[PDB]
């Protein structure tokens, strides 16, 4: 062990490693005695593939490049696949290919191997056709799901509805062969969920200017014999009741997660009256912000029990007995479970991680209570001693409100900083903003901590996991609350003598980008910052400048344009670009439909000539968020260079980023 300036420590964790291990298993699902899930493949053009885990343990990718399992529903991708076991010929599977947005069907166990075949038609109108949240009904030879069909060239010239697609591929080149189960009354809808007797279906629905975590309506309809929806009606919900998920329990009852009590709690619902009944009242979240159709937090087991990812702050998988009301969590090392779940027999399968291990596919058996890794088993790329030790903390702001944060102090088995020196800190603001960051192993963070630079991940006001009220704090307060809380923690660290007051950095992507930028503009707390595909031009963004799903998100974040037109100019970073006095780095994907690259151009134009050292890196082939391995490497090393140059340290393994005025 030797002494060295903070940020200059030699670390075995290089950007290449970070990228290589980015992402996690996702959209898990059971098919017979098999378990599938979507896994990233950054070195394969950033595509996502399907992984197939067999009963004997066999675990392999089921689709080779260039198939890409991801769709553009809500631009964030709704559940991309569905599979069913069969008496012979292996299971049947359907998935969405990102390249053409079409729905494909394939049989892994068919002679000749998996050979995807198209089931849906295409369109040259606007964003064309998109599909997601499918449900396979081989008995009717169809797959039902929700669908987006553009009717014009504008980001909002689109109609969504529940559809039925023939499995025989007869609609591959025939739009009329696709049946519209519901109407397009609601702009936003999720896929259908059929009751066990197959006579009643439910789905979530909402419209502008509400976000699903403000309020949604659980729609229902009687499924006729020939397969049509009849008597559609709202079973419950409204513009202020957020129903995050709805499922049919094997006994025919309806379970839903609603935040009517102030927290997302599970409720039994009468399939006719709508009468809801609590199953487990608690000040913990049993659901979350529904960003994409198909998210699952709870899942009913055939034996009457209910698997649930729950908690206040961190979320963990536990089994709930609606009868005794008792809930028993999974043990094991996992401290955070993702919002994906499936069940098979007496087992519940989810995706979890810990501060020491990356997200894995974990199984919790209800009869024994044992939890074990069954997929994507984590193995240390380097000695775990290079992973920082998170500190789940809470800071107190001037008014006494608590700010939840994760503090990752510099850490390394080989170095310690200079006696009379303090480590610089990177304050990160997650995206969303109606979201939350879990405290688990993240090489992106370790990347800095192992080099001697502290990291502080703030779950500012408006973050999920703490109840509707806490989520509401950001209503109309975007650009203020998120910014203040982050600065609150930063200065708190500097005061406590944990961090160097003079070497504090801010960074974030998307909403996290807006917060970082906003921080460099309306505050002088940071020495520099990294902004990734942010929101900097509100007026532009509100004027058809973002995808439909968030075309009115600003109504929640800063207030309606009708009531507060001044805030759209004031709160915008672009407006006060000239107020940025410290160096910064701008990262952006050129194909980003959520935050168009235009955002950056206008900002860069407003700062030009103000003599502030800065850099900008755009990437083609990258949408919202970087998925390609190469992209992440440049992005990461560029960010470290900025910090290295501004903090007066000399990082090794990275080239020097050219900052210009």
From TrEMBL:
<protein>
    <submittedName>
        <fullName>Aminopeptidase</fullName>
    </submittedName>
</protein>
<dbReference type="GO" id="GO:0008236">
    <property type="term" value="F:serine-type peptidase activity"/>
</dbReference>
<dbReference type="GO" id="GO:0004177">
    <property type="term" value="F:aminopeptidase activity"/>
</dbReference>
<dbReference type="Pfam" id="PF00326">
    <property type="entry name" value="Peptidase_S9"/>
</dbReference>
<dbReference type="GO" id="GO:0006508">
    <property type="term" value="P:proteolysis"/>
</dbReference>
<keyword id="KW-0031">Aminopeptidase</keyword>
<dbReference type="InterPro" id="IPR050585">
    <property type="entry name" value="Xaa-Pro_dipeptidyl-ppase/CocE"/>
</dbReference>
<dbReference type="InterPro" id="IPR029058">
    <property type="entry name" value="AB_hydrolase_fold"/>
</dbReference>
<feature type="domain" description="Peptidase S9 prolyl oligopeptidase catalytic">
    <location>
        <begin position="443"/>
        <end position="648"/>
    </location>
</feature>
<keyword id="KW-0645">Protease</keyword>
<dbReference type="InterPro" id="IPR001375">
    <property type="entry name" value="Peptidase_S9_cat"/>
</dbReference>
<keyword id="KW-0378">Hydrolase</keyword>
<dbReference type="InterPro" id="IPR011042">
    <property type="entry name" value="6-blade_b-propeller_TolB-like"/>
</dbReference>
């Amino acid at each position: 062990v030797s002494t060295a300036p903070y940020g200059a420590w030699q670390s075995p964790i290089d950007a290449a490693l970070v990228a290589s291990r980015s992402g996690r298993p996702a959209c898990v699902g059971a098919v017979g005695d098999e378990v599938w899930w979507v896994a990233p493949r950054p070195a394969e053009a950033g595509r996502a593939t399907l992984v197939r885990r067999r009963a004997d343990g066999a675990e392999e990718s089921a689709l080779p490049a260039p198939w890409n399992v991801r769709n553009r529903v809500f631009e964030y991708s709704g559940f991309p696949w569905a599979g069913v076991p069969r008496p012979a010929g292996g299971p049947l599977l359907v998935f969405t290919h990102f390249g053409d947005q079409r729905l494909y069907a394939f049989e892994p166990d068919a002679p000749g191997g998996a050979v995807p075949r198209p089931l849906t038609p295409v369109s040259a109108v606007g964003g064309g056709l998109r599909w997601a949240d499918p449900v396979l009904l081989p008995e009717r030879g169809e797959v039902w799901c929700m669908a987006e069909e553009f009717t014009g060239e504008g980001p909002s010239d689109v109609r969504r509805f529940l559809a039925a697609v023939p499995l025989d591929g007869s609609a591959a080149a025939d739009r009329s062969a696709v049946r519209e189960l519901s109407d397009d009354a609601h702009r936003f809808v999720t896929g259908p969920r059929l009751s066990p007797d197959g006579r009643q279906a439910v789905w979530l629905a909402w419209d502008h200017p509400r976000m699903p975590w403000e309020g949604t309506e659980l729609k229902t309809a009687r499924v006729t014999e020939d397969g049509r929806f009849a008597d559609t009606r709202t079973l419950l919900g409204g513009p202020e009741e957020a129903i995050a998920q709805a499922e049919w329990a094997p006994d025919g009852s309806l379970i839903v997660a609603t935040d009517r009590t102030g927290w997302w709690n599970l409720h039994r619902v009468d399939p006719a009256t709508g009468a809801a009944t609590q199953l487990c009242r608690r000040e913990e979240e049993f659901a979350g912000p529904l960003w994409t159709p198909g998210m699952r937090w709870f899942a009913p087991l055939a034996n009457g029990l209910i698997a649930v990812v729950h908690g206040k702050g961190a979320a963990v998988l536990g089994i709930l007995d609606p009868e005794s009301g008792e809930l028993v969590d999974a043990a094991g090392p996992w401290t955070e479970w993702a919002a994906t779940l499936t069940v098979s027999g007496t087992r519940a399968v989810g995706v979890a991680a810990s501060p020491r291990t990356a997200y894995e596919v974990v199984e919790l058996d209800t009869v024994t209570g044992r939890a074990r890794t069954i997929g994507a088993r984590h193995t240390d790329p380097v000695d775990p001693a290079y992973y920082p030790e998170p500190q789940i903390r809470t800071f107190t702001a001037p008014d006494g409100r608590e700010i939840h944060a994760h503090i990752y102090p510099p850490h390394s088995p080989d170095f310690t900083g200079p006696a009379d020196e303090l480590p610089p800190y990177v304050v990160m603001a997650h995206g969303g903003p109606t979201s939350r960051v879990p405290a688990v192993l993240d090489l992106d963070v370790a990347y800095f901590t192992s080099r001697g630079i502290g990291v502080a991940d703030v779950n500012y006001g408006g973050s999920t996991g703490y109840g509707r009220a806490y989520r509401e704090r950001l209503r109309g307060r975007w650009g203020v609350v998120d910014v203040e809380d982050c600065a609150a923690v930063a200065t708190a660290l500097a005061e406590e003598g944990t961090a160097d007051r003079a070497r504090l950095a801010v960074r974030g992507g998307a909403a996290g980008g807006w917060t970082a930028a906003s921080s460099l503009v309306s505050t002088d707390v940071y020495a520099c910052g990294t902004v990734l595909y942010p929101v900097l031009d509100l007026l532009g963004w509100a004027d058809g400048g973002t995808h439909d799903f968030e075309s009115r998100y600003l109504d929640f974040l800063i207030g309606s344009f009708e009531e507060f037109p001044e805030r759209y100019r004031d709160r915008a970073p672009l407006t006060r670009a000239d107020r940025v006095r410290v160096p910064f780095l701008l990262l952006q994907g050129l194909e980003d439909p959520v935050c168009p690259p235009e955002q950056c151009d206008r900002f860069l134009e407003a700062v030009a000539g103000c003599g502030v050292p800065h850099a900008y890196l755009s990437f083609e082939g990258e949408g919202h968020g970087f998925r390609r391995k190469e992209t992440m490497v440049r992005a990461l090393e560029a960010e470290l260079s900025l910090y290295a140059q501004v903090f007066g340290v000399e990082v090794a393994g990275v080239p020097l980023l050219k900052l210009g005025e």
